[PDB]
Amino acid sequence: DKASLNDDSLHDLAALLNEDSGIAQRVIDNARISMGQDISETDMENVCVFAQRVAS
Amino acid sequence: GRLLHTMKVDKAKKESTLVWSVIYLPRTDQIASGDSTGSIKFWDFQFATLNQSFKAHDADVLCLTTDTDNNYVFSAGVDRKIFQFSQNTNKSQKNNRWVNSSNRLLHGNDIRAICAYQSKGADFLVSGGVEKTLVINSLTSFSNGNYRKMPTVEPYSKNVLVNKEQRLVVSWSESTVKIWTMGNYKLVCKLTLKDDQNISTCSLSPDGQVLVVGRPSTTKVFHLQPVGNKLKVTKLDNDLLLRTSTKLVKFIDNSKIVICSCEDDVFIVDLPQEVELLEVTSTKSSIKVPYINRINHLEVDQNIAVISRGCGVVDILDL
Amino acid sequence: AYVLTETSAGYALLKASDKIYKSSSLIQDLDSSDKVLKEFKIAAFSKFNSAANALEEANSIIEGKVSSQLEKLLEEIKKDKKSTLIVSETKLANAINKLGLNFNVVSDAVTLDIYRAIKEYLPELLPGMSDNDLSKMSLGLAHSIGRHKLKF
Amino acid sequence: SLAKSPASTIQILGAEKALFRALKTKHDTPKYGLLYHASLVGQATGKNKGK
Amino acid sequence: KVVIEPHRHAGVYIARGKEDLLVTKNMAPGESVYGEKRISVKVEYRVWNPFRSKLAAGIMGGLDELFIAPGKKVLYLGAASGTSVSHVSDVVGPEGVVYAVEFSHRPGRELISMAKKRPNIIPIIEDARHPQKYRMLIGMVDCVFADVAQPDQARIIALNSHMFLKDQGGVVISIKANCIDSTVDAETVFAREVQKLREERIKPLEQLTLEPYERDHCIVVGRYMRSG
Amino acid sequence: PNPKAFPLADAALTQQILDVVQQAANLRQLKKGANEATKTLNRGISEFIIMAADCEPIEILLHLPLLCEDKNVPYVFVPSRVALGRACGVSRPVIAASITTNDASAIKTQIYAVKDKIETLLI
Amino acid sequence: VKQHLQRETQLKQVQQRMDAQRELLKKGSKKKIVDSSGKISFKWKKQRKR
Amino acid sequence: TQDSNYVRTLRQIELKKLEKGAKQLMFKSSGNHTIFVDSREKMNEFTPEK
RNA sequence: GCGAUGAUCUACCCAUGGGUGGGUACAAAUGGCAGUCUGACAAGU
C-alpha cells in the first residue's frame, strides 16, 4: 500500500529500476502526501496477484 | 420544531374572526383565549379541548390577565368593558368550571391592554387604552374596590417654556415649535425641525434672543431677531452641540450655557469646558436599575448650579 | 500571559507580556504584521506526531474535549500557580478550567482579532515554528476528517 | 443510480434494444432483459418466467 | 474555428464559435465532473451553466468588484454537489485555493470525489452555523462566497468572516427571497438584508437581481473594513 | 415518529392532504405507489408527492426525495399508510402517491393552495 | 429550440387526452358531464375498487 | 396502450433533446443593477462610464 | 565501372524549411444516434 515505504524501500527500488533518476524519492514523497483513497486489504492482495500474472 | 395541537374558535358568518389574545392558566392546566367573535373561551390544555365558552360582550377582546392563584382572570375588551371571571370558591375549584362573575366599564374611549400585579404591598391591575389615561383597580375586590384614574398629561418632562422678556411663550411637540406673544395673543413662529426625527426633549431660551433645542442624539442652536409682528430665526452651529447628547440644558447668561448628558457628563460653552462631579457607589438596586444613578435634575442660579440624582443625592457646582 | 492555538502543524502557545486592553491597542494599531509577530513571537510550540490517525482522533476529541498532547503540554505550560491563558472556545475553556491544573484562563472573548492576527502572521511563523507550507498537511487531514465523519 | 431507477426498469434493463424497437414501431414490449439468468427465473417455466 | 476571449475578471472566458459561451481553463482536463461539455483550442476548457450555478448568473449579470481572483484564497459556504465549487477552483487555478463547506451528506460524497480529482479543493463537511469545527482548520480566507438557505445568512457570514476574512476582505452572498420571506416583495427583502449586513460590518458595494435566470434571488457583494 | 423523514405534517395538514387526494383519485388524476410516483417524477408530470412515514423499512421510498430535490417538485409525508390507502381508494397500504397535472380539472385552486402549504413547510 | 418546445407541448397535450381516453376505457362507474363552456368531462362515483 | 407508449417515447425524445439544446444555447441577462453611494453629491455626479 | 536474379512507369500555400486537404489500419471518450413497459385485478370454491 501507499504507506509501508521507507528509505529502505527507497534503496530497494534502487536495486530495482532506478533511484539515481530520483523516481524513488518522487514516489516516496507522493506516497507521503498520497491522495488516492486507500482501499481494502483483499483488493491489495488480489491486485498483487493480478500484477504477478501480467508480469509472468 | 413541531406544531401538534390545533383548535378552532366558533366562527362568525359576515366576517373573518381572529383570536386576539391567549394566556396560560397554570393552576388548573388550561389556556384561556379572547377572540374577536366577542368571546372568552377556556380550553383545557391536556386533551386539547373545550371546557368553558362564554359570549363576553359585543366586540373583540384584546387582552387577558390573571392573578397568581389562577382564581381570578380579568378580560379587557375594546367595547370598554373589564370582566372578572372567578374560581376561588370551593366547589368551583373542585369542579374546575368558571363563572362570568362580574363586568364593569370605566374607560372613556376604549381599552388596549391589562396587566396585573399582586403582593402583600398592594394588589392591583392596570388597564391602559386610547383615552390617554391608566386606571388602577383592586384585584381582590374588583366588584368592590374603588378605581383610580391617573390622567393623560404628566408634566414631569415639560414641553413648554415662557420668556417674560418681550412677554411671549414657546411650546414644542414633535419637531414643532410654536411661539406666541401676548399683549390679545398672537402666534409668532413655527419650527418643524426638518433635520431631526425624534421628539425634542429639552429646548430652552434665555432672557433675550438666544434659543437651543436638544435631543440625546444631536442638538441645535438658534438666534432669533424680532422683525415686528413676526420674528426671524437663524441656525447657529457648533460641532460640540452637534455631537454631544443632552439630558438637560440651562442658561447662565445669553452667551454661557450648561449641558447635562446621559453619560452624566456636564459641559459649559460661551457661545469643551467641562466641570468635575462626585461619584456614586453602587448597591444591589444600583446594579439592577441602571438609570437611578443617573443625574435627575439640573438647576442654575446666576452662577451656582445644583444637581439632584436618584439616590435623593443633592450637590452644588460652582462654574 | 499565554495564548493557545491549535494547528494542523501542531499546538502553539504564544507568550503575551501583559488581554483586553491588548486587544484594543493591537486593533487600533493594526498589528497584522510580522513586526507584531516579533512583538509576540512564541512561548512554546509542540509539534504533533506524524500519525494521520492520531491527528484525526486529535481533531475529533478536540471538538469533543481536551486531547492527549494538550495535557502533555498543559502539564508544563504553567510558571506560577495562575498564568492567564487565551482560548478560542467556550467549551474548551470550560474543559481546561475543569481539568487538573486549576489555573486562570479567559474564554473566547473579544480576542477574535488577536486569534485572527496570529492566524494571519503564523505564515511568517512558518520560518519560526513550522518550517514548511502546511497546506498539503491540512489537505490530507481535511480529506481524512470528512471521510471519518461520514461512515465511509 | 441503480436504486434511483424504478421497478419496471430493473425488470427490463437488459433488452433495451428490442424494447426501443418495439416502442418506435408499435410492436409488443420485451419482458426479461438482464434478469434472465437470475436463478429464480432459471427454475420458472414460460409465462411463469415472465410473472 | 473557435475564438476565445477574456472577461473583465481573470480566468473567465467567452467562446465565440458557432456559439458564445462561458468557460474556464481546466487544470484537470478532459474529465467532465458533472456531464458538462467541454472545448479545446492547444489547451482545454470547461463550460458553465448559469442555470445551474448561481455565481455564473452573476458573472453574466455584470459585476465590477467580484473579489474572487486566480491568486487568491476563497471560502465557499453552500458548496453542494461540487459543481460551482469545482468551477471556482478551476478559475482560481493551482495557486488559488477553495475552502468548500457542506453539511448535507450525499453532495458531501460527491464533493469527496471532486476533491479526489482536484487539489485546489479543500472540503469541510461540517455545520453551517458552528464555525469552530472548521476554525481550527481554516486560515485567512481573503474572499468569501455563500449560497445558503438558512435564513441566518447575515449571521453565518458575520461569524465566519470575523474568524476568517482578512481586513478589507471581499464578501458575496446569494439570497432567496422566496426562501426567507415568501410574502413581501423581493425588493423589500433585499433592502432589508442589505442594512442587516450593513450593521454586520459589510460595506455593501453592489447587488445583482438574478432575474432572467432564476426566480427571486439577489447576489450581494461588499467589502469588509476595520473589522474583527 | 420515524426520525428519517424530515418534513412531516400535523393532523390539520394531514386532513387537508388526504381530502385533496380523495377528490383527485375520484377524478383519477392521482397515480399510486412508489414505483409509479418515480416514473411520473422522471416524466416531469408529477404535480407533487405524498409519502407515508410508516413504511417498514422507510428507505424503500426514502429514495424519491432525491428526485424531488433535483426536479424542484414539492414532497410531504403523512404518518399513516393504511390511511393513505383507504384515502386514495384501494384495498392495500400505499406507501406513496403523486398528484399529476391537468389544467382542465375542477380542482386547480385546491391543488395550488395545498402545494402552497407544502412549499411553506418545506422551505 | 422554439419548435422543439412547441412540438413538446403539442405532444404533451396529445398524450394527456389519449390517457384520458384510456381511463375512459378501464373500469368503474363513470359519469359524463358537459361543463359550462361546453367541454366534456368524466367523474367517477365514489367507489373503492376492490 | 401501444399508441400511448409510442407518443410518450417521442415526447421524451423531444423534451430532453430540448434541454440539451438549451444547455448549449445561451440567453441574455436582464437583471436590475442598483449601485451604492455614500453621499448625495456623489449620487449627482455619478456616471457609470467613469 | 546497368539490367530478365528485373530496366522504365501507378491534393494547396509560403524557395531540397514550415503551413493546409483528402484516403486506409489501431486506439480514445460522459460525442452522437439514444428514448428506459403498462398500473388493478387474479386464483380457488
Residue identified by cell 386533551 is B47
3-state secondary structure of A34: coil
CA distance H8 to chain F (A): 9
Q: Is H49 on the interface with E (CB under 8 A)?
A: no
CATH number, domain F1-123: 3.30.1330.30
Query: What's the Å distance between residue E4 CA and nucleotide I14 C1'?
Result: 27
The beta-carbon neighbor of C112 closest among E109, E112, E162 is E162
Chains E and C touch (3+ CB pairs under 8 A): yes
CB contacts, 8 Å: C136 with chain A: 33
Interface test with H, best of G4, G16, G24 (most H CBs within 10 A): G4
**By C-alpha distance, which of E133, B220, E173 is closest to C6?**
E133
Please answer yes or no on whether H36 and E204 come within 8 Å at the CB atom.
Answer: yes
Query: Which backbone phi and psi does B7 adopt, to 5 degrees?
Result: -120, 155
Give the three-class secondary structure for E167. coil
Whether H21 contacts chain E with CB within 8 A: no
Interface of G with H in 11-50 (CB under 8 A): 11-12, 14-15, 18-19, 22
Partner F contacted by G17 (CB < 8 A): no
B76: β partners: B63, B82
CA distance, residue C26 to nearest chain E CA (Å): 11
Q: Would you report the helix, strand and coil content of chain G in percent, each value rounded to 5?
A: 50, 15, 35
What is the DSSP code string of B137-201?
Answer: EESTTTTTSPPEEE-S--TTS--EEEETTTTEEEEEETTEEEEEEE--EEE------SS--S---
Where are the extended beta strands (E) located within chain F?
30-32, 48-52, 75-78, 96-99
Q: Whole-angstrom Cα distance, residue B139 to residue B123?
A: 6
As a whole number of angstroms, the distance between CA B56 and CA B77 comes to 9
Count of CB atoms within 10 A of residue B216's CB?
A: 14
Is chain F adjacent to chain G, meaning 3+ CB pairs within 8 angstroms? Answer: yes
Q: How far apart are the first and last CA of chain F?
A: 21
Q: At what angle do helices F11-27 and F108-122 cross, to 10 degrees?
A: 140
Nucleotide nearest to H1 (CA to C1'): I38
φ/ψ of residue H17, rounded to 5: -70, -35
- Which one of F28, F86, F91 has the shortest CB-CB distance to G44? F28
CB F56: neighbour CB atoms within 10 A? 9
Cβ–Cβ below 8 Å for H3 and D28: no
* Residues paired with F76 in a beta bridge: F50
Nearest DNA or RNA nucleotide to H5 (CA to C1'):
I37
In whole angstroms, I30 C1' to F7 CA is: 35
Kindly state the DSSP code that residue B38 receives in the 8-state scheme: T
C-alpha distance from G21 to closest chain H C-alpha (Å):
10
Residue type, B105: L
Counting DSSP H helices and E strands in chain G, the numbers are 1, 2
What is the distance between the alpha carbons of residues C124 and C130, in angstroms, rounded to a whole number? Answer: 9
Candidates H18, E104, B157; CA nearest to G9 is H18
Q: DSSP state, H16?
A: H
Q: Do H29 and E57 touch (CB under 8 A)?
A: yes
Which amino acid is present at F98?
S
- Taking CA–CA distances from H12, the nearest residue in chain F reads F43
Do β-strands E217-224 and B231-236 pair in parallel, antiparallel, or remain unpaired? unpaired
Report strand pairing: E143-147 vs E73-77: parallel
CB B259 within 8 A of CB B268: yes
SS3 F14: helix
Which nucleotides in chain I lie less than 7 Å from some protein C-beta? 30-41
Scanning every strand, the nucleotide with its C1' closest to G23's CA turns out to be I39
Cβ–Cβ contact F62 with D under 8 A: no
> From the CA of H37, how many Å to the C1' of I8?
90
Give the chain A residue whose CA is nearest to the CA of C143: A35
> Residue C32 in 3-state DSSP?
coil
- Nearest C-alpha in F relative to D3: F63
C-alpha–C-alpha distance, residues A46 and A43, integer Å: 5
One-character DSSP codes across C51-70: -HHHHHHHHHHHHHS--HHH
Query: How many C-beta atoms surround the C-beta of residue E201 within 10 A?
Result: 18
Among chain A residues, CA nearest to E113 = A37
Q: Which residues of F touch G47 (CB under 8 A)?
A: 89
Q: Which of E27, E18, E21, E26 is nearest to E7 (CA)?
A: E21
Whether the Cβ atoms of residue E173 and residue E157 lie closer than 8 Å to each other: yes
* Nearest to F11, CA basis, from G35, D18, B48: B48
Method: cryo-EM
Number of H helices, E strands in chain F: 6, 4
CA B289 to CA B291: how far, in whole Å?
A: 6
CB E79 within 8 A of CB E101: yes
Nearest CA in chain E to F117: E182
